């Protein structure tokens, strides 16, 4: 009960040694981040330029980074002034200091998800089963503390994160149905991209390295045996010398 329920293995499309991300799902997952989990969570380790050529086009990303504002170097008399964002800047979180985050969310500190996929045991299966694993009522026998919701997959059971995923709370730009199961499959894909933006290139450089090394490994066995051929079949004979000497 206190380890948390083990979550099963689902059919992610990027598992397997040759699969890349579905870049249509990274484009859709980014849309349900901006409108659902943008309010209480941060993404401090993602620059704006990494989105060009992966999820959005260059003119699309140069406009998304201009809706925000950044602090500029002081003017002619040292007064501070603001500037619009560019492609070299990072995604701004919703809260200025750690104290202001705990005030809005009942004292709980909502983590930064730029590394959540590699930082919660359960990999992609634990984020998906988290947002869809909420029962309508806690199991018989347990009375939750006020302000906390039950979720069995969470180690210990009781959690402070509510339900945020309903049906048709978001509209997509390509007509996909907006079901609770559909989005939860998408954010985990977009969040896995944020934690591993080298995902696709790593798996194709690996195929090149394995094929090169696996035939080098086999060629070395032939060369080892060719050079060891004179000692493998070497034959000894023994004839006792005479005891005259």
């Amino acid at each position: 009960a206190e380890h948390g329920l083990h979550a099963p293995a689902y059919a992610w499309s990027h598992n397997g040694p040759f699969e890349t991300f579905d870049h249509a799902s990274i484009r859709r997952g980014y849309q349900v981040y901006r409108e659902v989990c943008a309010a209480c969570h941060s993404l401090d380790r993602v620059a704006w330029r990494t989105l060009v050529g992966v999820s959005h086009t260059n003119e699309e990303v140069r406009n998304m980074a201009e809706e925000f504002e950044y602090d500029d170097e002081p003017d002619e008399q040292g007064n501070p002034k603001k500037r619009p964002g560019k492609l070299s800047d990072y995604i701004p979180g919703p809260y200025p200091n750690e104290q202001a985050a705990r005030a809005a969310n009942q004292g709980a500190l909502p983590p930064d998800l730029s590394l959540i996929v590699k930082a919660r045991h359960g990999g992609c299966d634990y984020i998906f089963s988290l947002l869809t694993g909420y029962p309508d009522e806690p199991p018989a026998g347990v009375a939750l503390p006020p302000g906390s919701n039950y979720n069995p997959y969470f180690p210990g059971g009781s959690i402070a994160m509510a339900r945020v995923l309903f049906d048709d709370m978001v509209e997509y730009e390509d007509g996909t149905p907006a079901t609770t199961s559909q989005m939860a499959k998408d954010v985990t894909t977009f969040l896995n991209w944020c934690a591993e933006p080298e995902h696709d290139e790593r798996k194709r450089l690996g195929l090149k390295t394995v094929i090169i090394l696996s035939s080098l490994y086999l060629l070395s066995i032939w060369v080892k045996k060719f050079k060891w051929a004179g000692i493998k079949t070497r034959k000894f004979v023994f004839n006792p010398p005479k005891p005259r000497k």
Partner: peptide, 25 residues
Amino acid sequence: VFDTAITSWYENHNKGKLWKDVKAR
């Protein structure tokens, strides 16, 4: 030659998923 041979099969095995296919859509 090996670089182009591996790159083309990798994109072919993942047709319909890469960025150039979504942007083409």
